[PDB]
Design a protein around this ligand. Structure first.
Ligand SMILES: [Cl-]
Ligand SMILES: [Cl-]
Ligand SMILES: [Cl-]
Ligand SMILES: [Cl-]
Ligand SMILES: [Cl-]
Ligand SMILES: [Cl-]
Ligand SMILES: [Cl-]
Ligand SMILES: [Cl-]
Ligand SMILES: [Cl-]
Ligand SMILES: [Cl-]
Ligand SMILES: [Cl-]
Ligand SMILES: [Cl-]
Ligand SMILES: [Cl-]
Ligand SMILES: [Cl-]
Ligand SMILES: [Cl-]
Ligand SMILES: [Cl-]
Ligand SMILES: [Cl-]
Ligand SMILES: [Cl-]
Ligand SMILES: [Cl-]
Ligand SMILES: [Cl-]
Ligand SMILES: [Cl-]
Ligand code: NI
Ligand code: NI
Ligand code: NI
Ligand code: NI
Ligand code: NI
Ligand code: NI
Ligand code: NI
Ligand code: NI
Ligand code: NI
Ligand code: NI
Ligand code: NI
Ligand code: NI
Lengths: 263, 263, 263, 263, 263, 263
């Protein structure tokens, strides 16, 4: 299975993951690397979006509003929450780079009537998950406790020598009250930039079992199974995750052999 | 090519095959394993459906009707026809498990105006196909001689030591008066339950040639080519098949090397 | 990655490439091999089409018109431009084979209001590209300088011992003013007919690097990367290409190591 | 894994399996298809051999012995035991085809001082193994109860439909008093000749799990795991097996899930 | 590539890696899991050996020497050096399990005239390599500064989270004064036992790039390239390595991008 | 299959192909990239060798012979024959680089008593094979009409565009008077150096069918089948081939479909 998508270029639409090229039904994930002064226009269509400023400042025109010079961090490694913008479906938007800009466009099916809204770093829930070699900084950009039709968005910091997305969990089957089907994308970053991590996507029966050396700005698709991330000594890791499915609830099942790591 | 889809769980939506994850255009196939008292709701959308009760009893609310305790067999290995329900498109339906229930939801594009209808075991055409090591019990749940927009549904019993879907046939190309393009899914069952069969999906030129060890509740996708099933001594086999394409007619071509087995 | 699609049959719809089975978003490509007197009907839908007569004569009924015995060449190897027909979306059309007919149906998303139009061999721009072992005859059936919503269509002749689609170029990423995302299909032909060529689809990082022995009437899909064609001594090559993407402009980037071959 | 070796030609040394090309330590297997009057010379080396006359008549000169026009069956499908000649190591041999000849040369390490000997039909143990979809005819050409340094040779007849090398067994690990490491080759034949069977080689953890479609005169290598053969309606099967390892004792372990098929 | 070898059984010769099955020239690695009172005999041949008592107590008879009840640790996770016995070539040896025993037999070509010798904990060099997420305990059982014809043997302890065989190094090419060709095996163990690590074997050009999920008692073969081990939170790792080549000198090259981690 | 071996380094033993790592029985091929003043020593063993000076000057000491500063061309692309030295088995040799040196060591089993000899340009048969897109320069360094126990060595120059090892031939089966089994290695070079060619290794049944993109100093292994080389406009190609088998005679069979290209 080919779950790894390496960047296609250095500038422009460096990552383009769609339901059509991912072989799935809900999640889309795009990254644009723009120079100061450049713009993109997002269309009025049947998809809701979450614009995540990974690095740099931007101005956004949408609905009847103008949002000027949103963003703050110049690197995701500043460890301060991303500035994001929620766009409902049927919303054309123009995004202009105020500085050089690394922009994530998270997409999923849209059908509701929520308004355009800003998700500033102060609206992002911050949590420190796990203990020891399992410690991670989590920024809940768009959790299931906040409003959206489909999208669930999170960014996670895993320092070199820690394991994250671990103990192994899956969200690949609708099992009422236990688990939901949620497609998931990982957009990875490293500090220093030449680093890599090892991500493994696997099922209990191992019918799917793929390990991948993931480098800076690579995407990993998670269509099913467990999906832990093992970082490498010397290279701090960051990832931006998008999830969506038929039911917007994060319900997962832990792999039974490793569930004791939560105790 | 990955044509085999093993069950993702023991309960809930254990099989979910869609045009999007199958890499094709028409056929969808879902299996739900429900405990007595649990329900699912099927949406009003652009897909027609055939609900097939593989094992157990169910109640269905659809259109202006209530169908109570439909089904009979508690195992597909009773060798009595499944109870099924035809749902046209734009038909919301609620299915409640009266007993523990193994429910197949067969789907394809819907566009007509046929009514909701019951397909009881007495409406299922029963035929005994082949002679010797080629003998099989066939239950024509929804054949091309019965009404539906797209769906063709059949279940077949192949006793241990027989070959079925054989002599090799294909339905992967529109060839006027000879063959139709029909995507096909296989949902396999074994008695005793720990068994397997060997299914081979292959083209004449062998550009596609994949053999698979298929276990209990596994799905095989047939996007093209010949697709025979070789059963194993000691393990009786059952499969539930769904087909659909642009033209709802079962027209196939026999592999010429093995066509003499029909003589 | 499986980028090669060999013919499924000798007659009827011998090639059927869709966004759904290609794992992409825009381009569809069909070939029909029809005997004199046979017909097909193309539907009124949301796709625009370019009918390309690869070999043989046809009559077309579309919109309020009847086009009788269009075509001329009985083989693509006559090296005279194909006769083609542009069909906008929402246009049902009936195509009848006047002689035995090899018909290419090129498709992409349609949304405009252009009329049905004939593209006769006299409307096709003819150019001789390259020098020496890089020489090729190019027929611009439907270039970006002519009108269509999405479709770009070209046919190219590469004589045995020449390389084409070379120096290596890619059109797989939206990079403003430099490159566009364009899915591309290749439909290959050989003279004598038992020949083959070697086509390689690869990225700069080699995460994708697939070489393929392509035979008569085979299709190669190009979802991303560089995609040169190396012909074989004794076997002249022909290919028919279809491209489409979000922006109908042919903008590509040359692989830097081989760009000097243009000098 | 690559366990299937198809014939490289119709005449001469059509099968050549060596420890060097098999990725293992002991077993060699060669097939020679000779016309009446042709000969081959086997060298004096460190390997013992068992020359199996699969079909046709041959004369064999080795050491102080000459065997004139030995053989009987003109096809393995006569279901009568083969003639064979055991050759110790350091024994040059000349084999002359008296009729058209299909000759199997089974080889393994030699170190002893056994004499050259004929293994006529009268020295072959004939047995019927299993009941029903499991009943095969077995010819023990060179069992562990007869003399050789390393070689174990058997031929088996599996009628169309039936499963052989079943219930699944393995002989891939030295487990004192339970199992021995024995490399194994299968040389397959079909009646009628255009047939195939499905052979699956797999381990308990499925780290190796390969199913292959086996045609006439193909060889399957079994370096480890379970290795059952599933035959296809209409096509009777035959195979000639060679085994060897560090300990010349046929000790195997049954896969636990299917062991009940022996009771 | 197929670099992972999982255990073939729970008892007996659970690991058997040979130059013939590894696709290389020097290194052999065997593991024997024996019950108290069981024995094995190692042959007199052209290979030298290093018998490593991974866990448990053993007696060893070889040439004019008898070692009674050597060993100490009942688990490799006691973090105390193993007892080992060096055997020159042409030296038959009998190993008797005094307790349940996990025995590693490390082999390589032998040509010299060194005597049989005990390598007790007092002859094992103990060192701590690296700082933080990089700090491992290393036991030099048989380094290049001690006597053997070919064999180099080391065991390493990597605590959960940490990265070992890192910064990435290779020893796959004879480069005078810089690097030697050395085949390498890894025999992995976990505490608790149900754990895994992720090991990646890769070259600078990524022509080889394999990441594998390694479980308890699995073997990884390193025929060339970089080969770091990434451990997982909760699961401590241990591995026993064997190396050999034409020149018995441990000379390696660091991957240039990660060499800074040594400063 | 894995038939391509890319260089492991820029200096030293950049190519090391052995029967053990190639999965075959006879051919060994090594390349050494040495700086002026460096030396290597070839051992006294059971292999005969042909030392080919691909580029640069070398002195060779072997048995009672010393060859001082032999060689001439500083690049294979000078299109003048190489100097080579034939070494029988049991012959230790010292090779000193007099200038920077690219040295090929071709090896195969040795058993005879031929003397050490120089193969100077005057002993190399020069021939031009084929017409047009098929015309190559061939240097028969060590043909079957010259003396050696096993080795067959040739170098071929294929100008950009042209196809070589074409029409397709195979030498993979002993067929008396028609074909011999001969393993074959290709050591490729390009001018300019950043180029590539496409080489396809395939059998008549396509059970093996591998096309690879070959770059400067890469090696392709041909264990069986047809093996043509398709060059790319702008990049001239060179390759040095080594062959050996049980019978030192170059006998091949042409693929029937392309045999007409010889007329
Ligand atoms: Cl949309
Ligand atoms: Cl996490
Ligand atoms: Cl739920
Ligand atoms: Cl729908
Ligand atoms: Cl059937
Ligand atoms: Cl029809
Ligand atoms: Cl449409
Ligand atoms: Cl071109
Ligand atoms: Cl642009
Ligand atoms: Cl005798
Ligand atoms: Cl007789
Ligand atoms: Cl059997
Ligand atoms: Cl035993
Ligand atoms: Cl001693
Ligand atoms: Cl002691
Ligand atoms: Cl280390
Ligand atoms: Cl050195
Ligand atoms: Cl001499
Ligand atoms: Cl000279
Ligand atoms: Cl040639
Ligand atoms: Cl010959
Ligand atoms: Ni709406
Ligand atoms: Ni997740
Ligand atoms: Ni409707
Ligand atoms: Ni079918
Ligand atoms: Ni419209
Ligand atoms: Ni292109
Ligand atoms: Ni002897
Ligand atoms: Ni066996
Ligand atoms: Ni000795
Ligand atoms: Ni190492
Ligand atoms: Ni000798
Ligand atoms: Ni050749």
């Amino acid at each position: 299975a080919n779950l790894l998508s390496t960047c296609t270029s250095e500038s422009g639409n460096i990552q383009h993951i769609s339901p059509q090229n991912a072989g799935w039904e809900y999640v889309g994930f795009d990254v644009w690397q723009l120079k100061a002064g450049e713009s993109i226009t997002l269309p009025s269509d049947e998809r809701e979006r979450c614009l995540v400023l990974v690095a740099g400042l931007a101005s956004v025109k949408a609905a009847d509003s103008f949002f000027y010079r949103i963003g703050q961090r110049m690197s995701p490694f500043e460890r301060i929450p991303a500035y994001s913008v929620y766009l409902p479906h049927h919303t054309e938007a123009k995004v202009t780079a105020e500085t050089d800009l690394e922009l994530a466009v998270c997409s999923a099916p849209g059908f509701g009537e929520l308004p355009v809204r800003l998700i500033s770093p102060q609206e992002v829930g911050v949590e420190h998950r796990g203990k020891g070699r399992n410690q991670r900084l989590v920024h809940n950009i768009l959790p299931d406790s906040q409003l959206a039709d489909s999208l669930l968005v999170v960014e996670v910091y895993t320092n070199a020598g820690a394991t994250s997305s671990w103990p192994a969990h899956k969200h690949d089957t609708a099992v009422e009250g236990q688990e939901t089907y949620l497609e998931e994308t990982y957009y990875h970053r490293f500090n220093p930039p030449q680093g890599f991590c090892l991500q493994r996507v696997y099922t209990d029966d191992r019918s799917l079992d793929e390990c991948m050396a993931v480098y800076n700005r690579d995407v990993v698709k998670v269509p099913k199974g467990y999906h832990p991330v093992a970082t490498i000594a010397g290279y701090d890791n960051y990832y931006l995750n998008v999830m969506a499915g038929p039911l917007r609830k994060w319900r997962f099942t832990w792999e039974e052999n490793h569930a004791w790591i939560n105790s």
